[PDB]
From a paper:
Oxygen activation in all heme enzymes requires the formation of high oxidation states of iron, usually referred to as ferryl heme. Ferryl heme refers broadly to a highly oxidized form of the heme in which the iron is in an oxidation state that is either one equivalent (FeIV, known as Compound II) or two equivalents (formally FeV, known as Compound I) above the resting oxidation state (FeIII). Here, we report 1.06 Å and 1.50 Å crystal structures for Compound II intermediates in cytochrome c peroxidase (CcP) and ascorbate peroxidase (APX), collected using the X‐ray free electron laser at SACLA. The results indicate that the ferryl species is finely tuned across Compound I and Compound II species in closely related peroxidase enzymes.
We thus developed an anaerobic procedure for direct formation of Compound II in CcP (see Experimental). Single crystal spectrophotometry at 100 K on crystals of CcP that had been reduced with dithionite under anaerobic conditions, followed by anaerobic reaction with H2O2 (see Experimental), showed absorption peaks for Compound II (λ max=530, 560 nm) that reproduce those in solution above. The Fe−O bond length extracted from this XFEL structure of CcP Compound II is 1.76 Å (with an error estimate from SHELX of 0.013 Å). Nonetheless, in this structure the Nϵ atom of His52 shows no density for a hydrogen atom and the imidazole is therefore more likely to be neutral (not protonated). The density for the guanidinium group of Arg48 is flat with all the hydrogens in‐plane, which is as expected when Arg48 is positively charged (Arg48 is also observed as charged in the neutron structure of Compound I). There are several key points to note when comparing with Compound I. First, the hydrogen bond patterns to the ferryl are the same in CcP Compound I and II (i.e. hydrogen bonds to the Nϵ atoms on Arg48 and the Nϵ proton of Trp 51) and do not allow space for a OH species bonded to the ferryl. These hydrogen bonds to Arg48 and Trp51 appear to be “locked in”, as the same hydrogen bonding pattern is observed in the X‐ray structure of CcP Compound I and in the neutron structure, Figure 5 B. Since the neutron structure of Compound I in CcP conclusively identifies a FeIV=O species (from the absence of nuclear density for a OH species), then we therefore interpret this ferryl species in Compound II of CcP as also being unprotonated (i.e. a FeIV=O species). That said, the bond length of 1.76 Å in this CcP Compound II structure is measurably and (within error) longer than that for CcP Compound I (1.63 Å). By comparison no such flexibility in hydrogen bonding to the distal Arg is observed in CcP, as the active site hydrogen bond structure is “locked” in a fixed arrangement that does not change between Compounds I and II.
Numbering used by the authors: 3 to 294
Amino acid sequence: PLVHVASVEKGRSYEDFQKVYNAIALKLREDDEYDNYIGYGPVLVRLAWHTSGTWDKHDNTGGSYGGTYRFKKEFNDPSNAGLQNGFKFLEPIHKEFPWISSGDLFSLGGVTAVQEMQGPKIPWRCGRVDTPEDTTPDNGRLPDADKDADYVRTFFQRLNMNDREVVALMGAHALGKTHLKNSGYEGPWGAANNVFTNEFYLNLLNEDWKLEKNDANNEQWDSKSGYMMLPTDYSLIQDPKYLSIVKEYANDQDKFFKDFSKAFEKLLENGITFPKDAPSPFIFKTLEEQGL
Ligand code: HEC
């Protein structure tokens, strides 16, 4: 197993990363029209997860550390279709702050998006270091959506996530939507899809779902409110262990926030060794908290 030791960008401290956070946050506010006024929040959360979610605990390949999505093999992974929009949004940020590593920027984009969308605070640590093109993981390590709960459970063991962490992370599917041209699935999961809430679990339990085929000839679950669930989303209410946890998060907003925060930080930190004297995780203030 490879070791990736966090190395703080030289001379940087919390203030420097709060400025990067702020630039991302201000651009999220400015470029509000994207994706029919959903805004870039959801795609940036997805970019942070896909750049992290290639990790393999068994050999420490993939993961957020190396920033490898900047290389064409990963950029062009069919599982990443659509994420180029988030990369494009981050380009002017990286140009302004060229000292931040790519993995630090992709992960911080996700943290900033969750918090600016009124999600929980996500502690975040710096020090990912860009690694060379030959460290890019091959395609095929991100999950399929047409699968059942057994597939989801097994898939996430590779990311060292347990049932609770899986169910909490999937609550990010409140955000954004599926786009047929990107993934073969179409529609949002709920109404509040650029504000981070526990709506995903409420809709799983509360909506009347019908198994339909979309225009790409794939099955998805649809509600008459115009929401959808992927087969892997719906698996969370088919499996009795996941269903218990879905009910818990549908009934406790604060517990979902706390558990999501922990699991998302862990996702973004998998694979990284933080030296004992590394800085503590940073908790960035939102623009609203700063009066900006
Ligand atoms: C914590 C983050 C998170 C996790 C974990 C996650 N997703 Fe997503 N996913 C998102 C976000 C956010 C979006 C919305 C992106 C957008 O609106 O551009 C999304 C969108 C998608 C889409 C639609 C992409 C498109 O633009 O068409 C698919 C398909 C998808 N997820 C599949 C899955 C599957 C399969 C899993 C696991 C079994 C999963 N996701 C786990 C955050 C996540």
